[PDB]
Amino acid sequence: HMTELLKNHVAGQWIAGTGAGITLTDPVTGVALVRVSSEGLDLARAFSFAREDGGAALRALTYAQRAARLADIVKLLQAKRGDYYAIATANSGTTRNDSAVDIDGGIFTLSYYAKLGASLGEVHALRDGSAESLSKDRSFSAQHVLSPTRGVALFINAFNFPSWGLWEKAAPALLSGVPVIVKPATATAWLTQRMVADVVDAGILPPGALSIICGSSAGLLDQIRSFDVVSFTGSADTAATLRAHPAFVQRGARLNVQADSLNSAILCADATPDTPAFDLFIKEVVREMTVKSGQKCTAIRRAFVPEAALEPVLEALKAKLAKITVGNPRNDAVRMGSLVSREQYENVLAGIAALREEAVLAYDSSAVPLIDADANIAACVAPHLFVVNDPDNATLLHDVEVFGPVASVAPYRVTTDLPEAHAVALARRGQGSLVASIYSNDDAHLGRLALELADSHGRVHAISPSVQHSQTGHGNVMPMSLHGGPGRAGGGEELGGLRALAFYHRRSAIQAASAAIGTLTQAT
């Protein structure tokens, strides 16, 4: 009578939604945590204030000045980490180590952009490439420039990364001088809203630079105009709804989508069980199934191995999966916590039942008692490993994503004369993915194989014994590398270091007297 109603931050003010709100709950214990509501907000005013007051204030600052503000946010969020870990344990049901992927991944990505940003200097627009002569006598030349878009950036983010989804987008947006309006997924919104409230309360950014709305999305796209940008992370079906809106179809606002992806792991023909690359493959597949209970868009969903390796691979995955204990993340003995909600628990079990129509269930620890959790309250699903003997004729293998601790292993036919050619073709049947990982003992071979996967995967991640200590993980997104993929993964691009700024800028060719191209360059 009652949990806290979290306020929205719109038009420079904290404003509660009306009504009873939507309750966020702990997915292990069932406790009611906080509520959200966007009912009754003045959305025209929220967008116009951000666009006008926020954008004008951010563009008045140089790139290096906005970078310095990002570095102050880093220090603030670092100081408040204990509060954020408590929210993540309760609202997301994740182990400490899994909560770190979201909290400390967010902070690390914001700090990387704060450091990249300081290098951009005390200017208000960036040069794109070098000057080029447009005349034999070099009297008339051209220089391309990037200028901040005079709009707002609206982020409609997914439930799995309330912190990193915010900061992976907000860091390049704010560095680019574009005000941010974040709309986190309701079930896990609390951490996003507490991080925004901490940053707003600190007065690091100007009024209007950072707004948040939690609750119903109704009305938001209707406020988007032609110079604004929208970044959506979520299901392919929802993305298709969004793409049809007049903001994009009529008004031409930029849209990035990152959607569902059936990411692959390919065990190379040389990586037989008596070689060190084989255990790296087994370990990475079990990690990606179990971190966050498989709720990473980049997790391994399909693992292709030589026919001759199939049984040794199943045996080694079963042995390693059996060490994953499941239950309340407050217990230090737990290796894997819950899904984000009981609704997701039901959705995952329905996905598992669907895949089982067409695959053999090779490992399922559902009957292992949970630790410190009631299976009728909590949203804990145990690891399930499927085997699909004939991946050429399988329907569901290459089409159906289960967003939980669930993956399928399938054999491929080694080519005797790349040995992994059939595995590349199978990977492609995922219709475009965020990431594939490839495992061999031969580094040079991995550089050649990577090129064959590049046109269908936004990232190719090569693990071999030489980098056992340094490879950064199949599903962990490093901010200097591109994040996105073609086709089913949404056709989007994020991060990639400075590449992420282009989405927030308009590019222009300036063609002028060569002296003027000089004075341009002194300002850029």
Residues that bind ligand NAP (CB under 6 A): 156, 158-160, 185-186, 216-217, 220-221, 233-236, 238, 241-242, 258-260, 295, 297, 401, 403
CB of 507 to its own copies, least distance (A): 6
Of 342 and 499, which CB lies nearer to its own copies in the complex structure? 499
Choose the binding region for its own copies from 128-136, 163-171, 277-285, 412-420 (rule: CB under 8 A).
128-136
Of 178 and 185, which CB lies nearer to ligand NAP in the complex structure? 185
Choose the binding region for its own copies from 88-96, 148-156, 188-196, 213-221 (rule: CB under 8 A).
148-156
Residues 301 and 401 sit within 8 Å (Cβ to Cβ): yes
SS3 383: coil
Task: Tell me whether residue 218 is exposed, middle or buried, using C-beta atoms within 10 angstroms of its C-beta: 0 to 12, 13 to 18, 19 or more.
Answer: exposed
Q: How far apart are CA 393 and CA 199, in angstroms?
A: 52
- The token pair at 112 is 């990387």
Q: Which does 444 bind (CB under 5 to 8 A by kind): its own copies, ligand NAP, none?
A: its own copies
Residues 213 and 166 sit within 8 Å (Cβ to Cβ): no
Work out which of 278, 493, 501, 504 binds its own copies, going by CB under 8 A: 493
Residues whose CB falls within 8 Å of the CB of residue 16, separated by 6 or more in sequence, listed in order = 5, 7, 8, 37
Q: Annotated binding residue at 281? A: no
Using the Cα atoms of residue 446, residue 451, residue 452 and residue 456 in order, give the sign of their dihedral.
Answer: positive
CB of 319 to its own copies, least distance (A): 27
Q: Which does 186 bind (CB under 5 to 8 A by kind): its own copies, ligand NAP, none?
A: ligand NAP
Q: 233: closest CA among 281, 295, 151, 165?
A: 165
CB of 444 to its own copies, least distance (A): 4
By CB under 8 A, the residues from 251 to 280 that bind its own copies are 252-254, 257
Q: Annotated binding residue at 183? A: yes
Judge if the upstream peptide bond of residue 2 is cis by omega within 30 degrees of 0.
yes
Q: What is the DSSP string of 165-192?
A: HHHHHHHHHHHTT--EEEE--GGGHHHH
Q: What is the DSSP string of 94-144?
A: --HHHHHHHHHHHHHHHHHHHHHHHTT-S-SSEEEEEEEE-STTSSEEEEE
Q: Which does 97 bind (CB under 5 to 8 A by kind): ligand NAP, its own copies, none?
A: none
CB of 58 to its own copies, least distance (A): 13
By CB under 8 A, the residues from 447 to 466 that bind its own copies are 447-448, 450-451, 453-462, 464, 466
| Residue reference for tokens 């109603």 | 5
Q: Which does 295 bind (CB under 5 to 8 A by kind): its own copies, ligand NAP, none?
A: ligand NAP
Which residues participate in the annotated binding site for NADP(+)?
157, 159, 183, 186, 217, 234-235, 238, 259, 297, 483
